[PDB]
Amino acid sequence: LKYNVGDLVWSKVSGYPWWPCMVSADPLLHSYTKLARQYHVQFFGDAPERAWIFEKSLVAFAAAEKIKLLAPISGKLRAQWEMGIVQAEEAASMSVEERKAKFTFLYVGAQLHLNPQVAK
Ligand SMILES: CCN(Cc1ccncc1)c1cc(C)nc(N2CCC[C@H]2CNC(N)=O)n1
């Protein structure tokens, strides 16, 4: 396995630029990887987005030399992407256990929430 929970990656989703995220356990399935291999990630930004991504569409954040990193220009997506970058940079400066406690999304009822530390 190339990744574990808490690892910072860039993931490519169709219709989006390469986005900063953190490998995490799917809070419904209780698993972070499965079978080609997939990994569950949460996307840094202003909304609690998550997804199962194939390993070919993931690379470490901070194989990595072969991808083309392109930043969004469109205002709305760019500001969300910049928020994700600021958060992934702060997470990169912390230990794996500190970033799991600070950035892991929380289910409150059936509603997926940003980690209250991030929300505040
Ligand atoms: C490639 C990462 N992103 C951008 C993003 C991430 C985290 N926060 C903001 C934007 C994703 C990924 C996925 C699977 N879905 C989405 N979304 C669907 C609805 C619009 C957008 C963002 N959500 C929102 N309420 O504004 N975005």
UniProtKB/Swiss-Prot annotation:
Domain PWWP: 5-62
Localization in the cell: Nucleus; Chromosome
Tissue expression pattern: Widely expressed. Predominantly expressed in thymus and testis.
SUBUNIT field: Interacts with HDAC1. Interacts (via PHD-type zinc fingers 1, 2 and 3) with SALL1. Interacts (via PHD-type 1, 2 and 3) with SALL4. Interacts with NANOG. Interacts with OGT. Interacts (via HMG box) with NKX2-5.
Disease as annotated in the protein's UniProt record: Rauch-Steindl syndrome: An autosomal dominant disorder characterized by poor pre- and postnatal growth, facial dysmorphism, and variable developmental delay with delayed motor and speech acquisition and impaired intellectual. Other features may include hypotonia and behavioral abnormalities. A chromosomal aberration involving NSD2 is a cause of multiple myeloma tumors. Translocation t(4;14)(p16.3;q32.3) with IgH.
Role description: Histone methyltransferase which specifically dimethylates nucleosomal histone H3 at 'Lys-36' (H3K36me2). Also monomethylates nucleosomal histone H3 at 'Lys-36' (H3K36me) in vitro. Does not trimethylate nucleosomal histone H3 at 'Lys-36' (H3K36me3). However, specifically trimethylates histone H3 at 'Lys-36' (H3K36me3) at euchromatic regions in embryonic stem (ES) cells. By methylating histone H3 at 'Lys-36', involved in the regulation of gene transcription during various biological processes.
Family: Belongs to the class V-like SAM-binding methyltransferase superfamily. Histone-lysine methyltransferase family. SET2 subfamily.
Identification of the protein by name: Histone-lysine N-methyltransferase NSD2
Name of the gene encoding the protein in the UniProt record: NSD2
